[PDB]
Amino acid sequence: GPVWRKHYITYRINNYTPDMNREDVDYAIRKAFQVWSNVTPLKFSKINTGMADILVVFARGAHGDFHAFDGKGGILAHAFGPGSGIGGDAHFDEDEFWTTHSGGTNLFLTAVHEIGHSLGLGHSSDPKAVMFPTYKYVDINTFRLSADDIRGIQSLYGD
Amino acid sequence: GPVWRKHYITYRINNYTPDMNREDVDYAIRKAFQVWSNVTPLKFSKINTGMADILVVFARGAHGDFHAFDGKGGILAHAFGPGSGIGGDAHFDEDEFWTTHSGGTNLFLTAVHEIGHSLGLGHSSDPKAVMFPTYKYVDINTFRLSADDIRGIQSLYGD
Amino acid sequence: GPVWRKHYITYRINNYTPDMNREDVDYAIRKAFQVWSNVTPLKFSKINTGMADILVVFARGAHGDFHAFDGKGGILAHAFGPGSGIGGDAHFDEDEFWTTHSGGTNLFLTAVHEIGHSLGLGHSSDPKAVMFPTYKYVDINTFRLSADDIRGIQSLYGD
Amino acid sequence: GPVWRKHYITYRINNYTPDMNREDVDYAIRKAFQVWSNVTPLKFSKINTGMADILVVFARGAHGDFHAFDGKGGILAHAFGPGSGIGGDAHFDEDEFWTTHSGGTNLFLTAVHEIGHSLGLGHSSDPKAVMFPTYKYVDINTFRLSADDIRGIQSLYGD
Amino acid sequence: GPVWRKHYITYRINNYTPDMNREDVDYAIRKAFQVWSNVTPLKFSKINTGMADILVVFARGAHGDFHAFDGKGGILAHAFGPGSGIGGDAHFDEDEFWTTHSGGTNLFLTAVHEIGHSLGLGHSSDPKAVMFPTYKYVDINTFRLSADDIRGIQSLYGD
Amino acid sequence: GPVWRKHYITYRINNYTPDMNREDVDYAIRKAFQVWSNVTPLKFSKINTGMADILVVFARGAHGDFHAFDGKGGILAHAFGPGSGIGGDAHFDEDEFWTTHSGGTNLFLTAVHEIGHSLGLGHSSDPKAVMFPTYKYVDINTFRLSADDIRGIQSLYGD
Ligand SMILES: O=C(O)C[C@@H](NC(=O)c1cc(-c2ccc(-c3ccncc3)cc2)cs1)c1ccccc1
Numbered sequence: 040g041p042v043w044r045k046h047y048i049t050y051r052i053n054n055y056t057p058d059m060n061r062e063d064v065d066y067a068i069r070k071a072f073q074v075w076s077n078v079t080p081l082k083f084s085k086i087n088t089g090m091a092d093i094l095v096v097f098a099r100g101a102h103g104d105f106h107a108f109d110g111k112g113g114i115l116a117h118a119f120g121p122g123s124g125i126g127g128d129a130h131f132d133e134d135e136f137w138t139t140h141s142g143g144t145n146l147f148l149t150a151v152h153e154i155g156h157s158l159g160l161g162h163s164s165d166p167k168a169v170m171f172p173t174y175k176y177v178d179i180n181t182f183r184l185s186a187d188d189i190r191g192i193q194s195l196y197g198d
Numbered sequence: 199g200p201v202w203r204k205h206y207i208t209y210r211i212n213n214y215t216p217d218m219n220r221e222d223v224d225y226a227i228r229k230a231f232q233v234w235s236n237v238t239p240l241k242f243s244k245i246n247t248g249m250a251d252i253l254v255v256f257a258r259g260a261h262g263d264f265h266a267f268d269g270k271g272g273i274l275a276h277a278f279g280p281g282s283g284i285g286g287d288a289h290f291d292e293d294e295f296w297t298t299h300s301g302g303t304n305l306f307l308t309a310v311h312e313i314g315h316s317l318g319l320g321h322s323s324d325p326k327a328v329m330f331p332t333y334k335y336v337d338i339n340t341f342r343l344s345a346d347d348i349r350g351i352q353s354l355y356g357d
Numbered sequence: 358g359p360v361w362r363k364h365y366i367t368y369r370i371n372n373y374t375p376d377m378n379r380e381d382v383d384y385a386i387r388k389a390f391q392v393w394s395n396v397t398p399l400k401f402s403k404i405n406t407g408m409a410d411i412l413v414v415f416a417r418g419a420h421g422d423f424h425a426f427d428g429k430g431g432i433l434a435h436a437f438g439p440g441s442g443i444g445g446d447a448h449f450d451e452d453e454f455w456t457t458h459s460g461g462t463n464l465f466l467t468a469v470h471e472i473g474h475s476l477g478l479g480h481s482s483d484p485k486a487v488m489f490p491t492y493k494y495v496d497i498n499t500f501r502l503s504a505d506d507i508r509g510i511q512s513l514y515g516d
Numbered sequence: 517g518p519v520w521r522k523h524y525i526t527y528r529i530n531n532y533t534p535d536m537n538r539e540d541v542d543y544a545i546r547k548a549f550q551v552w553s554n555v556t557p558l559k560f561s562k563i564n565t566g567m568a569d570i571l572v573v574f575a576r577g578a579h580g581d582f583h584a585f586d587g588k589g590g591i592l593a594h595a596f597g598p599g600s601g602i603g604g605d606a607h608f609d610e611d612e613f614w615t616t617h618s619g620g621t622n623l624f625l626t627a628v629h630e631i632g633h634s635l636g637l638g639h640s641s642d643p644k645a646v647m648f649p650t651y652k653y654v655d656i657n658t659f660r661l662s663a664d665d666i667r668g669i670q671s672l673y674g675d
Numbered sequence: 676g677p678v679w680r681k682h683y684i685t686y687r688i689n690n691y692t693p694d695m696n697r698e699d700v701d702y703a704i705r706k707a708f709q710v711w712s713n714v715t716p717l718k719f720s721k722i723n724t725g726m727a728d729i730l731v732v733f734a735r736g737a738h739g740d741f742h743a744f745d746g747k748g749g750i751l752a753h754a755f756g757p758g759s760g761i762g763g764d765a766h767f768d769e770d771e772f773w774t775t776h777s778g779g780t781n782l783f784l785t786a787v788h789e790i791g792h793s794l795g796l797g798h799s800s801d802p803k804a805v806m807f808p809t810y811k812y813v814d815i816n817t818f819r820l821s822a823d824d825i826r827g828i829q830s831l832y833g834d
Numbered sequence: 835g836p837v838w839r840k841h842y843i844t845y846r847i848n849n850y851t852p853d854m855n856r857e858d859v860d861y862a863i864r865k866a867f868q869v870w871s872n873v874t875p876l877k878f879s880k881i882n883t884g885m886a887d888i889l890v891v892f893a894r895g896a897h898g899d900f901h902a903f904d905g906k907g908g909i910l911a912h913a914f915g916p917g918s919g920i921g922g923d924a925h926f927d928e929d930e931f932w933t934t935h936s937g938g939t940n941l942f943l944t945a946v947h948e949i950g951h952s953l954g955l956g957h958s959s960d961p962k963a964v965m966f967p968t969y970k971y972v973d974i975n976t977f978r979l980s981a982d983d984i985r986g987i988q989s990l991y992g993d
């Protein structure tokens with residue numbers, strides 16, 4: 040489907056990457072969702088058990104969805120759009136080195152991008168958008184959504 | 199799908215309306231389901247956590263399913279038929295004043311109607327059916343399903 | 358889903374009611390779609406053979422979708438929202454007397470409403486909207502969608 | 517889904533086995549559908565081009581649906597239940613020798629069984645039912661569904 | 676769908692048959708899943724609450740999926756392929772007498788067969804395969820998957 | 835789903851870009867499918883009317899699937915993976931200048947990539963693969979899939 044037909048969406052962290060502290064991961068992911076709930080009527084809640092709408096997973100190589108990871112570098116992550124099962128799920132390539140900042144690959148920034156896909160956003164052709172296909176680091180304190188990003192997400196969920 | 203392909207169906211009360219006591223809501227909803235399980239092989243169970251087949255929700259205005267509520271009066275509630283995700287979900291317009299009896303809008307009676315939709319029943323053209331499109335109050339102690347209602351639900355689930 | 362994920366939609370008149378001339382049925386249905394395409398980016402095309410997104414059917418009593426018609430009066434027609442299979446399909450009760458005027462049930466006016474459902478619109482609580490649940494004849498020459506009708510349909514397909 | 521949500525169903529013979537004359541294949545398949553339409557409100561129509569609800573195909577070995585045929589003998593055919601895509605589709609193993617008599621494998625008798633699956637019927641444990649899992653030839657002139665066959669099919673489509 | 680698009684699959688025992696000790700049932704089922712995870716990248720986890728991918732159920736007669744059981748003998752069990760809802764679910768006919776060994780019907784062996792279906796395997800025509808349609812008892816200590824079984828499951832999930 | 839569950843797939847060119855001759859568009863699209871059928875058990879057929887598995891469309895700006903094109907440059911095209919409805923559909927941005935050579939954007943080369951998506955292939959991180967995300971012109975006479983392209987496509991359809 041093009042969008043989640045509800046405002047209360049849940050997510051769950053399937054497993055944790057040993058690259059970061061469990062709570063730094065929770066923080067990065069939660070702040071990532073917060074980026075999108077700030078400009079839409081959507082609200083996100085983390086759950087530890089049961090099925091959630093969006094399952095955040097860390098994995099390497101082939102992990103069952105037929106879109107295997109490629110080791111360090113190259114593809115860093117991917118996610119599926121709204122739907123049942125794997126729909127909305129965001130997978131992070133464990134072969135990358137996830138960090139809270141500019142060392143290795145920043146989890147927060149990458150998560151903001153993937154959640155974009157999870158909510159129904161495709162790639163943007165605007166270099167300022169978080170949905171632009173190329174990864175780059177910017178400080179979390181000064182990071183913000185481009186206008187193209189706001190338009191896209193609001194086109195889908197309004198507010 | 200036209201029907202739930204199982205006899206054990208679960209439901210969960212997403213949130214409670216502040217118009218009634220939490221337990222009066224539980225009672226109204228549970229008795230509503232009981233009305234249908236009495237004439238079919240179906241059985242309903244309430245769960246507090248995890249995804250349930252039927253999510254009972256209280257909400258106002260636009261709540262994400264693209265069928266926004268209209269404030270007090272007019273549409274009182276709605277529900278989707280059997281299926282994944284929002285399928286089977288029953289939404290109650292919080293702008294209405296829900297009551298245990300004839301004050302405002304009776305939750306039990308409305309719930310019986312919506313659960314009818316949740317189980318796959320459309321609107322009936324018979325004025326005596328609970329599936330008739332027009333809301334009316336009747337005492338819970340003397341309320342009963344019309345023959346048209348029994349035929350419809352049994353046509354779907356038998357017994 | 359909540360909407361057809363395309364602007365070019367096809368429909369097919371499965372069979373014709375013997376109440377009107379084939380040419381009149383086609384005209385009425387064509388005009389009904391036109392009402393909605395005039396306020397959205399949508400474009401409609403009629404096909405004579407093969408699968409269409411929207412199948413217009415005339416039937417009576419139980420016709421397979423578990424929402425049996427009730428003979429003369431009452432249920433005049435019904436339609437399923439966007440989706441595969443019967444999704445988007447519009448069924449007209451052949452037990453009604455379809456006409457091009459104010460006598461019997463007006464095909465054109467009923468079609469505009471049904472197509473509203475086929476496009477993803479639910480019932481409106483505004484008495485002036487074509488999506489209001491109650492059928493009524495109105496000058497078929499000065500007929501126009503109500504604001505609520507325009508808002509809702511453009512909320513889905515924009516323009 | 518458990519059943520086709522309509523009474524008018526279409527089928528298409530994708531390709532013909534070189535074992536029989538085109539006319540004989542058509543006759544056998546037509547007679548097979550007739551068996552079921554005679555005991556239900558269902559009506560079947562063959563189309564020569566385009567998508568049908570039920571696609572009849574002759575294939576051998578691995579043919580794309582992950583349920584590869586086994587060459588001569590063993591699996592004679594299989595079909596998917598009601599649904600979109602390959603749902604309802606019936607596949608006949610071209611490695612079998614299809615005939616109009618008791619030699620080789622009888623097309624007509626195998627078709628009645630396969631169509632049972634296409635309509636939503638699973639295997640029966642009654643030795644006298646066409647849905648019993650074991651293929652056997654029987655006088656194709658006095659052939660008739662068993663009671664279990666009638667009950668099950670009318671349990672889905674009634675009449 | 677043809678396969679579960681993930682390597683971590685969960686299952687849950689809906690209810691227990693009174694024929695065996697609760698833990699003997701857990702053991703039989705768990706060992707059954709182990710048989711398949713041994714030759715694939717798949718991994719299975721039991722959960723007590725929430726929805727699981729594969730729901731193991733004990734039931735008699737008609738239980739809602741339109742594939743009613745037939746009492747003692749005949750059909751012993753069945754399961755649906757990968758998918759949402761009932762997809763992947765394995766149902767065991769309670770009218771059979773389930774045992775840890777050769778008395779009555781062996782639960783472990785039957786479970787290995789049904790889970791095969793749950794993972795997307797159809798019936799095999801090879802008499803040595805666990806996916807062969809006919810039930811037979813062999814000691815759990817010397818039971819092993821046929822080559823045909825290994826090929827099928829690995830064709831779907833690799834490794 | 836991850837893949838088309840059949841070896842015979844149909845496609846239809848919904849409309850033609852005015853940039854090239856109808857004959858050239860057909861040739862380019864035909865050659866694009868040929869690239870993939872040459873390395874898999876798949877067979878492709880073009881149909882002029884009716885529903886195809888893969889619908890090739892030329893469009894500009896917002897065209898209904900919520901993934902609007904961006905005018906000249908940037909997004910050249912996109913396609914949906916295997917599935918019903920728009921599943922498998924390939925959209926080409928009419929704002930691009932489609933050609934049979936190295937000027938403008940080469941239709942054939944872009945089609946091979948898009949069809950990769952339509953068949954279930956995601957983007958590759960190998961610079962030599964047609965599925966790499968970056969469009970580039972290459973001698974359309976010595977063009978050949980990269981090993982990564984062959985592995986991935988045969989991983990889904992084999993051969
Ligand atoms: O490293 C790369 O950029 C290429 C690689 N990319 C990825 O896998 C991915 C790149 C991103 C991504 C993350 C953050 C931002 C972003 C935007 C704006 N402000 C801050 C952050 C943009 C994209 C997610 S996966 C890739 C290679 C090959 C094929 C597909 C993708």
Ligand SMILES: O=C(O)C[C@@H](NC(=O)c1cc(-c2ccc(-c3ccncc3)cc2)cs1)c1ccccc1
Pocket residue numbers: 272273274275276307308311312326327328329330331332333334335336480481482483489490
């Ligand atoms: O108030 C109304 O009746 C109109 C309004 N209705 C609703 O929203 C609704 C009305 C009902 C309903 C509730 C109970 C009963 C019933 C039947 C038999 N015995 C006891 C109770 C019937 C319908 C649910 S939502 C409405 C307005 C505009 C468009 C659609 C619906």
Ligand SMILES: O=C(O)C[C@@H](NC(=O)c1cc(-c2ccc(-c3ccncc3)cc2)cs1)c1ccccc1
Pocket residue numbers: 322323324325331332427428429430431432490491
């Ligand atoms: O006399 C009878 O037996 C019943 C007759 N049915 C009817 O007249 C019916 C009247 C209605 C009805 C529909 C909508 C609303 C409504 C009003 C305001 N806001 C929202 C919704 C009220 C009534 C449904 S059937 C009938 C007869 C024969 C066959 C079918 C129906």
Ligand SMILES: O=C(O)C[C@@H](NC(=O)c1cc(-c2ccc(-c3ccncc3)cc2)cs1)c1ccccc1
Pocket residue numbers: 321322323331430431432433434435466467470471485486487488489490491492493494495
């Ligand atoms: O209205 C009835 O007679 C009851 C019956 N209704 C229907 O089947 C239907 C009523 C309509 C309908 C058609 C046109 C208009 C309309 C609005 C504004 N201007 C012009 C035309 C409104 C509704 C379509 S089906 C019904 C019965 C039971 C449950 C729901 C609806």
Ligand SMILES: O=C(O)C[C@@H](NC(=O)c1cc(-c2ccc(-c3ccncc3)cc2)cs1)c1ccccc1
Pocket residue numbers: 586587588589590591649650799800801802808809
């Ligand atoms: O000799 C061989 O290798 C095996 C041969 N396969 C067979 O004969 C086969 C026999 C059966 C079989 C099917 C159903 C039942 C049955 C009986 C009673 N109640 C329910 C179900 C028993 C057996 C399947 S394949 C075969 C050979 C070549 C190709 C395919 C199959």
Ligand SMILES: O=C(O)C[C@@H](NC(=O)c1cc(-c2ccc(-c3ccncc3)cc2)cs1)c1ccccc1
Pocket residue numbers: 589590591592593594625626629630644645646647648649650651652653654798799800808
């Ligand atoms: O029967 C076989 O040779 C085994 C094979 N079976 C099949 O493929 C099939 C057997 C049948 C079948 C056809 C007709 C009748 C029938 C019933 C009553 N009166 C007349 C006709 C029963 C079954 C269709 S496919 C098979 C192999 C492996 C797994 C399941 C089934």
Ligand SMILES: O=C(O)C[C@@H](NC(=O)c1cc(-c2ccc(-c3ccncc3)cc2)cs1)c1ccccc1
Pocket residue numbers: 639640641642648649749750751752753784785788789803804805806807808809810811812813
């Ligand atoms: O009792 C029978 O075999 C027929 C009956 N079968 C079933 O319901 C079923 C039979 C089985 C089955 C269980 C274990 C094994 C097996 C294979 C290899 N090694 C050890 C164990 C094979 C099949 C599951 S349900 C049946 C009757 C009628 C219609 C369909 C099926």
Ligand SMILES: O=C(O)C[C@@H](NC(=O)c1cc(-c2ccc(-c3ccncc3)cc2)cs1)c1ccccc1
Pocket residue numbers: 163164165166172173904905906907908909967968
């Ligand atoms: O100048 C502009 O405004 C932006 C222009 N857009 C672009 O040039 C764009 C460049 C890219 C891009 C795509 C993939 C990769 C990449 C590289 C390596 N590994 C993986 C992925 C890098 C960039 C997307 S749009 C544009 C203009 C007008 C309309 C659309 C796009």
Ligand SMILES: O=C(O)C[C@@H](NC(=O)c1cc(-c2ccc(-c3ccncc3)cc2)cs1)c1ccccc1
Pocket residue numbers: 162163164172907908909910911912943944947948962963964965966967968969970971972
């Ligand atoms: O490449 C661009 O100009 C950016 C844009 N890309 C596209 O739309 C697209 C790029 C391609 C593509 C076509 C052919 C080849 C290829 C590979 C090897 N040998 C020959 C040909 C690679 C990619 C299809 S759409 C884009 C923008 C924003 C987000 C994703 C992609």
Ligand SMILES: [Ca+2]
Pocket residue numbers: 108109110111112113114115132134135
């Ligand atoms: Ca990587």
Ligand SMILES: [Ca+2]
Pocket residue numbers: 056058132133134135136137
């Ligand atoms: Ca790592």
Ligand SMILES: [Ca+2]
Pocket residue numbers: 267268269270271272273274291293294
């Ligand atoms: Ca209201």
Ligand SMILES: [Ca+2]
Pocket residue numbers: 215217291292293294295296
């Ligand atoms: Ca209230």
Ligand SMILES: [Ca+2]
Pocket residue numbers: 426427428429430431432433450452453
């Ligand atoms: Ca009527």
Ligand SMILES: [Ca+2]
Pocket residue numbers: 374375376450451452453454455
């Ligand atoms: Ca009539």
Ligand SMILES: [Ca+2]
Pocket residue numbers: 585586587588589590591592609611612
């Ligand atoms: Ca065979």
Ligand SMILES: [Ca+2]
Pocket residue numbers: 533534535609610611612613614
């Ligand atoms: Ca043959």
